[PDB]
Amino acid sequence: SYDRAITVFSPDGHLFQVEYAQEAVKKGSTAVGVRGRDIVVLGVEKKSVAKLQDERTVRKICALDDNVCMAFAGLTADARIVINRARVECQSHRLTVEDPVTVEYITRYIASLKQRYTQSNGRRPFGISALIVGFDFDGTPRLYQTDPSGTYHAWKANAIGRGAKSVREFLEKNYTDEAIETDDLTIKLVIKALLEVVQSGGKNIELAVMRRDQSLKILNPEEIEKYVAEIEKEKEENE
Amino acid sequence: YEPPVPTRVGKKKKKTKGPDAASKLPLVTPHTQCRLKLLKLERIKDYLLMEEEFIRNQEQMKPLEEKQEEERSKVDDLRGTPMSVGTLEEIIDDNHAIVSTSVGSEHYVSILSFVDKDLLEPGCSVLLNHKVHAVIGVLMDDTDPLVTVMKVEKAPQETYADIGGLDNQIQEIKESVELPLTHPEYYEEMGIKPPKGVILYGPPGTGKTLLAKAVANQTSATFLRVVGSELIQKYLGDGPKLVRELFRVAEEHAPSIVFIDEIDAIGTKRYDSNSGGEREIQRTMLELLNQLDGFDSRGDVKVIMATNRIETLDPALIRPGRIDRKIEFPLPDEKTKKRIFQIHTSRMTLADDVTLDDLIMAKDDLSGADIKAICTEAGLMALRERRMKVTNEDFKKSKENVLYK
Amino acid sequence: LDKQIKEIKEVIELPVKHPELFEALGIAQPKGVLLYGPPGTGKTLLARAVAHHTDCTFIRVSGSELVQKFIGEGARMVRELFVMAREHAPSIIFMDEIDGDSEVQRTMLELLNQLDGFEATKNIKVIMATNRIDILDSALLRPGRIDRKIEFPPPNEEARLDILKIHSRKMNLTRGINLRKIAELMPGASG
Amino acid sequence: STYSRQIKQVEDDIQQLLKKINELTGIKESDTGLAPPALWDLAADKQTLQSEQPLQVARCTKIINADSEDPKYIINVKQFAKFVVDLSDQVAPTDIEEGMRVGVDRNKYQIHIPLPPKIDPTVTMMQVEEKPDVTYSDVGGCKEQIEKLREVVETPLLHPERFVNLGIEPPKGVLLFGPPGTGKTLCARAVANRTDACFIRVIGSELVQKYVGEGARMVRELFEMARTKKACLIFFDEIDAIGGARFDDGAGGDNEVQRTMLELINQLDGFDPRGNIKVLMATNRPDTLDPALMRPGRLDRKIEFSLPDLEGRTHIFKIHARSMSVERDIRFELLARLCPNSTGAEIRSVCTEAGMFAIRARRKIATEKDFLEAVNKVIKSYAKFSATPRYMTYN
Amino acid sequence: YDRGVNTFSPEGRLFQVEYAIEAIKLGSTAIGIQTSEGVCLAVEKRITSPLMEPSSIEKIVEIDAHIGCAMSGLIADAKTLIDKARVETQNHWFTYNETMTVESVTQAVSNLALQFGEEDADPGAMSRPFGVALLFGGVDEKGPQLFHMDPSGTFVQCDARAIGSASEGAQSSLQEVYHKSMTLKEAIKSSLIILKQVMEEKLNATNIELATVQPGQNFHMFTKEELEEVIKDI
Ligand SMILES: Nc1ncnc2c1ncn2[C@@H]1O[C@H](COP(=O)(O)OP(=O)(O)OP(=O)(O)O)[C@@H](O)[C@H]1O
Ligand SMILES: Nc1ncnc2c1ncn2[C@@H]1O[C@H](COP(=O)(O)OP(=O)(O)OP(=O)(O)O)[C@@H](O)[C@H]1O
Ligand SMILES: Nc1ncnc2c1ncn2[C@@H]1O[C@H](COP(=O)(O)OP(=O)(O)O)[C@@H](O)[C@H]1O
Ligand SMILES: [Mg+2]
Ligand SMILES: [Mg+2]
Ligand SMILES: [Mg+2]
């Protein structure tokens, strides 16, 4: 058994392996999640869309359960382990409690699993950040973010990936009660957020929405293209 | 017997070099064409008018032996011909010094009165009388061949307009190498010394040298360029000696900008000619540490370093105080890649069937060097077919040449 | 090497003789050439030929300390060669890798960096000859440094006949020699 | 614009007058190193060229029959020849000793004047002639460090009476060690500014020489020239260049540099007394130094420049933001708290970048937000390149 | 690197332990005051974005109905320590039918510190110290009691202890304001004055956490309305 301390404290008091895992998060696709009134929107930028790539396989938005879905940023192979481990726990929680998992619970389990890899022998930290969105049993929309360190916080809106700082700065200015009055405005908010870092346009945007008492709905490219026209249309009248 | 004691404080020469000498007229203000400036201008003229009359009267009654052209003629007689070139080994006294001729024989000779005594420093080239070897002048040292290598005599033709997408990078680099010289008042009114050092790091081809070339084009200061691999020498101590001499040329040509391009190449490449191994490179680095931020006071020297491997550098080399700013040069995005293609295809004549949007996605990890290499090879393909207009087929065969194979 | 002669002309001959062709095309004049192939395939033969035909001074940089007294008493940088290269423009600086890290490759980088945009005088071209192209540094293999890489494959049956036809003229040959058969008798041979 | 015509008229006359003045006075040449004619004593120079004969530099080797009234001196005239000569009648016999350079005439080679010992020009340039512009007031958070530094390198020379009366031999060596940017060279620059004795700055990489035994030679001549002064200070910046620990790697790894370190160790504490030299070495890699060099009697005091504490960091912030155009209520204690383990070099950069953001926004006063952004850019964003984490293990 | 986790410095310092202590100085400031009327625990949430929900930043935790903990340093690391404290308590209750003393809870958690190593360890053993400092506060037989834990496993009763980024400044402020005979309402106020002086942001009822364990009464986190009542003064 490989029993070695990968993550150790630097003399300043930093866990450098955790910081390096957070550096891999900054090299991933920009994932944007906005918590609306009755909808949760997850938006992920697509890296170098190839006409020969099956878009079904490389999907950064996956459903842990019927009411919880997450989008990641970082190492794709690292994330798929976390999603599978989270998926198994969602079914274990449902078997014991006979109640669908809460977003707080599965973001706590993923964060605890991520933290365990920053303090366990022979294991390097998970190099992904998760944007977990979903709905509780009482219909409250919840949006949570985890980092490789293991810290989870609830966000009204957040961005992870390479352009997280730019999108988050954009989100802090445009996230208002009026901007999430309707589902369509909430979906436009993520597209407006992702247009700040996506250069080409809607062809590099993957959108997944989840409504209350509904399953995760991946938005087709035609539906996304319809939205970007509206934002482009609304840009003209504001000039 | 008692040892002679100098009246001059120390053994080094005067720091000031290349001044206006006695032509240092008082700085008259304001520069506006007003009466106060006219009154001050007349004021300087009045004293000169007195000066001209006073000096003429003395020389008029001065003895025929003591005349400006006669004393100069007597100086040549005192100097004699030929005028031997020696080396100043020690300044024993104000008018006495130990000098060595080219044959290695030292002499205890007398420094004559007409010698510029404030140019005297140990190791300097002194002019000696052929017969009595007395110090009779100091040879203004010719520009070393080592000086000519660092100095970029002609500013490169690359401007900031030829750089696309590095708007923040230009802005950060300007504020440490350009803004402090053009508008030094901004830093003085704020009470801050300008950012001391700057390092440009990123993937290869991202424009690190290009921004330095743009800096060298629009700089009033001397630009010295040295590749990091040039600091690996074939002899012990020469590497540290060269780093010491490089910043010595920077001191003389103040204000100056020293560009240590490919600084990481000093350690990431091992050459058998380097007698000392990694240990001599470490001593070369330790000399570089002192020059960037050390005991000796640094004049108006701004240091630019460039590297595509910043993780391999000694962390103490790029610490704040030595290199204040660490400007990153990422691979271009779609907006920047289009600008780079426009920059390098501007002087081209293109065909109507060529489109830069398709050329944007030639490769995901596309750098500006690859973009430029596509263009020049595309033009070379057109040159082969005796054409001036570059077609899309030329660009297609261009991508398969530079990006692949 | 008829194909290779054309390739090297478009990069070393045309920029010197016709700078206006490149200015009209709007492309930068080429400055770096790399000739790669098995030893004895004509890389040094072709590099000297172009310098001879273009009236460009041919300078071979072997890094020899025996020639350092001519380069300059300093000898601290190989860029001290540029002083004598500028004085003899047009010039061709040729280094051949005989094959720690490679000093010829190190010299190539230092010359190419100065020749990038930091050199005032034009018409100073630089050639590198190497046995293999995959051993090259990532810095030299980076696009934009070496503007053309010319391959020198070992001569085939027909090319060996031409090389045989060239060197046999310097001998008193009996009439009727079947140089074609001798060429067929030397598979995979260098010039 | 009304005076434009007349200003050029008087400006040209001044230039014409200036050139005319240079015609009579003489301001020219300056490439053969000719001094301005105001200092030309031609009458004296003619007398010196005859009255004062030139003297060839020679080294006395042996005195033969020094007891008798005919003492004969063997001299080595550099590369010329060796001569058995007698002493001149205008110098005392007791003034010439064996092994001392002398000045001899060209006719009979009789010794005319003793000469100072030969010192390498590079070693001569090592002594500081212009003091730095840094005082102890520019070093913050090093209160205990400075007092220890001053009471060994400053107090004995300023007030030597307080140590002779009590029979106290003050330490003659201080080693400053700490991570980069902690103020090691800053304190030595303050020492040179304040000191009144001779200060010699020696960088360890300067002692690395091409030839065998040359580096140890420069250490010998360095201490030889330091001993020609009543009190002296030698600063060895980055002593890890030559002070590395001795080892045997089969081949002659670092054998030459170890000899230079062995020479430095010999001069500090060997058979001979060192003198009134008080050495001072700074290194960010003290773990690499040889145990013999790190021993009392060579480096008696080991002053550690650790990263400043909260009080020290607030003091360094006050030092570097003293001349800034800061706002009213800059919470410098808060800024010191935002960089827990940060060198004083980072604090200075934080101050520079804080005012650099204000220049960016065309603002003449630096706000607290500018410092907060500067801390993020320096302490946080530039933490990838931080030399601190790797160098605290070394110190 | 070459050094292992269980390596001693030449000065007798466990390198990893000393390094983990430096991690607290990057954590948020937490102030704990022990009074005769109860224990006070305050901590700054340190919001970095208006889009972050302040309620999700849980830096004060219910260890049990009679004891709570305030954490500073690496928040993710204290979850492992908090979980056992919530497991060790309810294990004392299972075996002894009584609430575990605050000192014993801190003693049990302290044993987890230094239970780290590279070799000859269980598969579930940790690899590095817990880079967090805990401020346990609760009520037991000995009345109100405040205990401070550090990554070295060293726990001690403290009358008023401040941990975090501003431990030095707040502790000095605490010494000037703490007297043994003072009310808990004074402790709530005095801790909030010190916090407002050390916080980067402006102090309000959303960026702080207040908790109290009075005798008789249970562990009580202060709500927004309760916090605004004491914030309105100072
Ligand atoms: N952002 C850019 N805008 C315009 N031209 C660019 C840009 N980036 C690169 N180029 C082009 O690429 C050429 C080669 O790149 P350059 O010499 O600047 O590389 P570098 O960043 O210094 O990298 P390295 O030395 O690691 O290869 C330049 O001469 C320039 O024409
Ligand atoms: N205690 C301090 N007080 C004020 N300014 C300081 C202090 N320490 C460092 N600085 C600033 O940081 C700079 C760092 O340079 P310094 O010569 O002090 O570094 P050093 O400790 O010798 O580093 P190195 O080990 O890399 O040689 C100084 O020039 C000074 O401006
Ligand atoms: N293709 C060729 N045609 C004619 N002669 C050749 C050819 N290749 C090699 N040679 C002969 O071989 C000799 C050395 O070849 P050289 O050019 O040094 O090989 P390389 O290309 O490896 O440098 C030359 O003098 C030349 O006469
Ligand atoms: Mg470059
Ligand atoms: Mg060959
Ligand atoms: Mg230093």
Tell which residue, A204, A216, A215, A122, has the closest CA to residue A163. A204
Q: Give the C-alpha separation, B241 to B231, whole Å.
A: 9
Task: Report whether B158 contacts B217 (CB < 8 A).
Answer: yes
Q: Give the C-alpha separation, E198 to E167, whole Å.
A: 9
- Listed in sequence order, the residues at least 6 apart from A71 whose beta carbon sits closer than 8 Å to its beta carbon are A31, A33, A42, A43, A44, A60, A61, A62, A130, A131, A133, A208
Token pair belonging to D158: 């300023």
Token pair belonging to B248: 């010595």
**Sole residue written with tokens 């006719």:** D107
**Sole residue written with tokens 């990968």:** A6
Distance of CA B353 to the CA centre of its chain: 47
Pocket of ligand 3 contains residue C191 by CB under 6 Å: yes
Pick from C24, C100, C142: which is nearest to B205 by CB?
Answer: C142
Using DSSP's 3-state secondary structure scheme, residue A204 falls into: helix
With contact defined as 3+ CB pairs under 8 Å, the chains touching B are A, C, D
Q: Give the C-alpha separation, D209 to D53, whole Å.
A: 38
Q: Give the C-alpha separation, D214 to A72, whole Å.
A: 62
Nearest ligand, measured from the Cα of C47: 3
Q: Give the C-alpha separation, E114 to A27, whole Å.
A: 35
Helix axes E167-177, E184-198, angle to 10 degrees: 140
Task: With residue C9 as reference, give the H or E element that holds it.
Answer: none
Using DSSP's 3-state secondary structure scheme, residue A72 falls into: strand
- Amino acid of residue E208: I
**Sole residue written with tokens 């102030």:** E31
Helix axes E75-88, E102-112, angle to 10 degrees: 130
Distances D73 to D59, D61, D94, E209 between C-alpha atoms, Å: 10, 7, 12, 93
Chain breaks in chain B following residues, C–N > 2.5 Å: none
User: Which atom of ligand 2 is found nearest the CA of B290?
Assistant: 27
Using DSSP's 3-state secondary structure scheme, residue A69 falls into: strand
First to last CA, chain D: 68
Q: What are the chain B neighbours of D325 within 8 Å (beta carbons)? A: 189-191
Residue B185: burial class (beta carbons within 10 Å; 0-12, 13-18, 19+):
exposed
Task: Report whether B75 contacts B125 (CB < 8 A).
Answer: no
Rounded to the nearest angstrom, the distance between the alpha carbon of B332 and the centre of ligand 1 is 11
Q: Give the C-alpha separation, B361 to A49, whole Å.
A: 10
Q: Give the C-alpha separation, A133 to D223, whole Å.
A: 73
Tell me the longest C-alpha to C-alpha distance in chain B: 96
Q: Give the C-alpha separation, E104 to E115, whole Å.
A: 18
- Listed in sequence order, the residues at least 6 apart from E205 whose beta carbon sits closer than 8 Å to its beta carbon are E224, E227, E228, E231
Q: Give the C-alpha separation, E18 to D393, whole Å.
A: 12
User: Sign (positive/negative) of CA torsion E188, E193, E197, E203?
Assistant: positive
Residue A234's φ and ψ, nearest 5 degrees, are: -70, -20
- Listed in sequence order, the residues at least 6 apart from A3 whose beta carbon sits closer than 8 Å to its beta carbon are A121, A122, E118, E119, E121, E123
> Would you say how long chain B is, in residues?
405
Q: Give the C-alpha separation, A219 to A46, whole Å.
A: 14
- Amino acid of residue D94: T
Strand order across the A157-160 sheet: A157-160, A31-35, A39-45, A205-211, A217-218
- Give the pairing of strands D301-304 and B197-201: unpaired
- Listed in sequence order, the residues at least 6 apart from D67 whose beta carbon sits closer than 8 Å to its beta carbon are none
Q: Quickly list DSSP for C47-111.
A: HHHHHHHTTPEEEE----TTSHHHH-S--S-GGGHHHHHHTT-SEEEEEE------HHHHHHHHH
Q: Give the C-alpha separation, A67 to D363, whole Å.
A: 51
Token pair belonging to D124: 């001569």
Is B203 labelled a binding residue?
yes
What's the gap in Å between the CA of A12 and the closest CA on chain D? 6
Q: Residue A228's domain spans which residues?
A: 1-239
- Amino acid of residue D158: L
Token pair belonging to E68: 């709570």
DSSP code of C11? I
Q: Give the C-alpha separation, A204 to C57, whole Å.
A: 54
Tell which residue, B13, B4, B2, has the closest CA to residue B110. B4
**Angstrom resolution of this structure:** 2.9
Task: Report whether A196 contacts A163 (CB < 8 A).
Answer: yes
- Amino acid of residue E15: F
Q: With an 8 Å Cβ cutoff, is A8 touching chain D?
A: no
Strand order across the D277-283 sheet: D198-203, D232-237, D277-283, D173-177, D301-304
Rounded to the nearest angstrom, the distance between the alpha carbon of C34 and the centre of ligand 5 is 14
Q: Give the C-alpha separation, D367 to C129, whole Å.
A: 60
Q: Give the C-alpha separation, D60 to A86, whole Å.
A: 91
Q: Give the C-alpha separation, A90 to B108, whole Å.
A: 95
> Would you say how long chain D is, in residues?
395
CA angle B47, B49, B50 (to 5 degrees): 65
**E2-234 in CATH: which number?**
3.60.20.10
- Residue B371: CB atoms within 10 Å: 29
Residue E51's φ and ψ, nearest 5 degrees, are: -80, -15
Q: What are the chain B neighbours of C103 within 8 Å (beta carbons)? A: 271, 273
Using DSSP's 3-state secondary structure scheme, residue A29 falls into: coil
Helix axes D310-320, D344-360, angle to 10 degrees: 40
Tell me the longest C-alpha to C-alpha distance in chain D: 91
Is B277 labelled a binding residue?
no
Tell which residue, B339, B403, B398, B401, has the closest CA to residue B366. B403
Number of domains, chain A? 1
Using DSSP's 3-state secondary structure scheme, residue A92 falls into: helix
Task: Report whether B105 contacts D78 (CB < 8 A).
Answer: yes
Is D155 labelled a binding residue?
no
Give bridge partners of residue E14 from the DSSP assignment. Answer: E8
- Cis upstream peptide for B30 (omega within 30°): yes
Task: With residue A157 as reference, give the H or E element that holds it.
Answer: strand A157-160
- Amino acid of residue A74: G
- Residue E42: CB atoms within 10 Å: 28
Give bridge partners of residue B390 from the DSSP assignment. Answer: B350
Q: Give the C-alpha separation, A199 to C139, whole Å.
A: 30
Q: Give the C-alpha separation, B36 to B33, whole Å.
A: 8
User: Sign (positive/negative) of CA torsion B65, B68, B70, B72?
Assistant: positive
Pick from E16, E53, E131: which is nearest to A154 by CB?
Answer: E53
Pocket of ligand 3 contains residue C90 by CB under 6 Å: no
**Sole residue written with tokens 């660490």:** B326
Task: Report whether C112 contacts C82 (CB < 8 A).
Answer: no
Q: Give the C-alpha separation, D37 to D30, whole Å.
A: 11
Pick from D333, D372, D393: which is nearest to E169 by CB?
Answer: D333
> Would you say how long chain A is, in residues?
239
Q: Give the C-alpha separation, D214 to D218, whole Å.
A: 6
Task: Report whether D194 contacts D137 (CB < 8 A).
Answer: no
Cβ–Cβ gap C27/B348 under 8 Å: yes
Task: Report whether B394 contacts B353 (CB < 8 A).
Answer: no
Instruction: Rounding to the nearest 10 degrees, give the CA dihedral for residues B96, B99, B101, B102.
Output: -150
Note which residues in 149-188 of chain B have CB less than 8 A from chain A: none
Tell which residue, D89, D87, D114, D82, has the closest CA to residue D101. D114
First to last CA, chain E: 49
In three-state form (DSSP H/G/I as H, E/B as E, the rest C), the secondary structure along chain D is CCCHHHHHHHHHHHHHHHHHHHHHCCCCCCCCCECCHHHCCHHHHHHHHHHCCCEEEEEEEEEECCCCCCCEEEEEECCCEEEEEEECCCCCHHHCCCCCEEEECCCCCCEEEECCCCCCHHHHCCECCCCCCCCHHHCCCCHHHHHHHHHHHCHHHHCCHHHHCCCCCCCCEEEEECCCCCCHHHHHHHHHHHCCCEEEEEEHHHHCCCCCCHHHHHHHHHHHHHHCCCCEEEEEECHHHCCECCCCECECCCHHHHHHHHHHHHHHCCCCCCCCEEEEEEECCHHHECCCCCCCCCCCEEEECCCCCHHHHHHHHHHHCCCCCECCCCCHHHHHHCCCCCCHHHHHHHHHHHHHHHHHCCCCCECHHHHHHHHHHHHHHHHCCCCHHHHHHHC
Token pair belonging to D304: 């550690």
Q: With an 8 Å Cβ cutoff, is D340 touching chain A?
A: yes
Q: Give the C-alpha separation, A75 to A127, whole Å.
A: 6
Task: Report whether E28 contacts E163 (CB < 8 A).
Answer: no
User: For an interface test with C, which of B150, B163, B226, B229 has the most C Cβ atoms less than 10 Å from its Cβ?
Assistant: B229
Tell which residue, A142, A147, A141, A134, has the closest CA to residue A208. A134
Task: With residue A106 as reference, give the H or E element that holds it.
Answer: helix A103-116
Q: Give the C-alpha separation, B316 to C9, whole Å.
A: 49
Q: How many CA atoms lie within 13 A of C185 on its CB side?
A: 6
Pick from B282, B286, B295: which is nearest to D235 by CB?
Answer: B295
Is C43 labelled a binding residue?
yes
Q: Give the C-alpha separation, D244 to D285, whole Å.
A: 9
User: Sign (positive/negative) of CA torsion B109, B110, B115, B117?
Assistant: positive
- Residue D30: CB atoms within 10 Å: 15
- Give the pairing of strands D277-283 and D173-177: parallel
- Residue C184: CB atoms within 10 Å: 12
Cβ–Cβ gap A11/D340 under 8 Å: no
Cβ–Cβ gap D341/A16 under 8 Å: no
Query: Which sequence spans correspond to the domains of chain E?
Result: 2-234
User: Which atom of ligand 3 is found nearest the CA of C38?
Assistant: 22
Pocket of ligand 3 contains residue C40 by CB under 6 Å: yes
Using DSSP's 3-state secondary structure scheme, residue A131 falls into: strand
- Cis upstream peptide for D37 (omega within 30°): no
Q: Give the C-alpha separation, A143 to A33, whole Å.
A: 7
Q: What are the chain D neighbours of B11 within 8 Å (beta carbons)? A: 124, 127, 129
Q: Give the C-alpha separation, B341 to E118, whole Å.
A: 54
In three-state form (DSSP H/G/I as H, E/B as E, the rest C), the secondary structure along chain E is CCCCCCCECCCCCEHHHHHHHHHHCCCCCEEEEEECCEEEEEEECCCCCCCECHHHCCCEEEEECCEEEEEEECHHHHHHHHHHHHHHCCCHHHHHCCCCCHHHHHHHHHHHCCCECCCCCCCCCECCCCCEEEEEEEEECCEEEEEEECCCCCEEECCEEEECCCHHHHHHHHHHHCCCCCCHHHHHHHHHHHHHHHCCCCCCCCCEEEEEECCCCCEEECCHHHHHHHHCCC
Token pair belonging to C133: 């192209």
Q: What are the chain B neighbours of C120 within 8 Å (beta carbons)? A: 153-154
Look up the CATH number of the domain holding residue A180. 3.60.20.10
Token pair belonging to D183: 């103020």
- Method by which the coordinates were obtained: cryo-EM
Q: Give the C-alpha separation, A60 to D315, whole Å.
A: 49
In three-state form (DSSP H/G/I as H, E/B as E, the rest C), the secondary structure along chain B is CCCCCCCCCCCCCCCCCCCCHHHCCCCCCCCCCCHHHHHHHHHHHHHHHHHHHHHHHHHHHCCCCCCHHHHHHHHHHHHCCCEEEEEEEECCCCCEEEEECCCCCEEEEEECCCECHHHCCCCCEEEEECCCCCEEEECCCCCCHHHHHHECCCCCCCCHHHCCCCHHHHHHHHHHHCHHHHCCHHHHHHCCCCCCEEEEECCCCCCHHHHHHHHHHCCCCEEEEEEHHHHCCCCCCHHHHHHHHHHHHHHHCCCEEEEEECCCHHHHCCCCCCCCCHHHHHHHHHHHHHHHCCCCCCCCEEEEEEECCCCCCCCCCCCCCCCCEEEECCCCCHHHHHHHHHHHCCCCCECCCCCHHHHHCCCCCCCHHHHHHHHHHHHHHHHHCCCCCECHHHHHHHHHHHCCC
Q: Give the C-alpha separation, D253 to C179, whole Å.
A: 59
What's the gap in Å between the CA of A50 and the closest CA on chain E? 34
Tell which residue, E72, E217, E73, E71, has the closest CA to residue E144. E217
- Residue D320: CB atoms within 10 Å: 22
Task: With residue C113 as reference, give the H or E element that holds it.
Answer: helix C103-117
Task: Report whether B264 contacts D170 (CB < 8 A).
Answer: no
User: Sign (positive/negative) of CA torsion D383, D387, D390, D395?
Assistant: negative
